[PDB]
Amino acid sequence: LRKTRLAQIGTGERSEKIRTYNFPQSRVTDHRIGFTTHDLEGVLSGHLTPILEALKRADQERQLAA
RNA sequence: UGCCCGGUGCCGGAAGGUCAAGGGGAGGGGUGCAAGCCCCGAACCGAAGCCCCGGUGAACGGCGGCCGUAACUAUAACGGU
Ligand SMILES: [Mg+2]
Ligand SMILES: [Mg+2]
Ligand SMILES: [Mg+2]
Ligand SMILES: [Mg+2]
Ligand SMILES: [Mg+2]
Ligand SMILES: [Mg+2]
Ligand SMILES: [Mg+2]
Ligand SMILES: [Mg+2]
Ligand SMILES: [Mg+2]
Ligand SMILES: [Mg+2]
Ligand SMILES: [Mg+2]
Ligand SMILES: [Mg+2]
Ligand SMILES: [Mg+2]
Ligand SMILES: [Mg+2]
Ligand SMILES: [Mg+2]
């Protein structure tokens, strides 16, 4: 339970980031794949379905073999 | 060589409360023709001791429980009761 979190959370510093919610530019960016929407209000309201799907397609495009 | 004098001990306290013998003798009783003789007996005065008020530990002794809370988990300096 402990070592697993240190893979997920880690140091929690400004780096190590998975997603930026920069209110100035109304942007939510998943830096690990490059998908960025611009509905920072709807995303924060709970419409995270596109970000999960856009990671889902790049999730099996982690299984591209030979 | 710390904190606790509520209990026990000891020390201090001419007040107060309780308290024996004794003092007191309201008012009762027995007996006698009577004068009397004989018993009972309220209030009230009346020590120490105990009660009561303090002090006292190198006097007898005694020195808690539960719940919550911090940049990973853990822990809890902190808080509540
Ligand atoms: Mg004591
Ligand atoms: Mg005392
Ligand atoms: Mg004492
Ligand atoms: Mg006593
Ligand atoms: Mg004394
Ligand atoms: Mg008498
Ligand atoms: Mg007399
Ligand atoms: Mg008369
Ligand atoms: Mg007569
Ligand atoms: Mg006395
Ligand atoms: Mg006392
Ligand atoms: Mg001592
Ligand atoms: Mg003892
Ligand atoms: Mg004791
Ligand atoms: Mg914690």
Side-chain angles (χ1 to χ4, degrees), chain A residues 19-37:
Chain A
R19 193 105 34 81
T20 290
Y21 306 77
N22 170 269
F23 285 19
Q25 312 280 20
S26 161
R27 189 201 60 258
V28 185
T29 319
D30 193 288
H31 320 81
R32 335 165 248 175
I33 64 159
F35 175 81
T36 159
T37 156

Side-chain angles (χ1 to χ4, degrees), chain A residues 1-40 42-55 57-65:
Chain A
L1 190 46
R2 182 188 178 109
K3 308 168 303 195
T4 310
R5 288 192 190 87
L6 272 64
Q8 301 177 316
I9 280 189
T11 323
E13 210 53 51
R14 271 157 189 96
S15 308
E16 303 173 353
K17 88 267 88 200
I18 252 44
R19 193 105 34 81
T20 290
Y21 306 77
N22 170 269
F23 285 19
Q25 312 280 20
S26 161
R27 189 201 60 258
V28 185
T29 319
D30 193 288
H31 320 81
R32 335 165 248 175
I33 64 159
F35 175 81
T36 159
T37 156
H38 271 74
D39 207 30
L40 173 96
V43 157
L44 281 170
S45 291
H47 318 336
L48 259 202
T49 111
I51 304 203
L52 288 175
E53 299 172 354
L55 278 143
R57 36 183 71 101
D59 195 353
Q60 217 191 195
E61 286 175 45
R62 209 182 316 233
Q63 329 298 308
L64 310 185

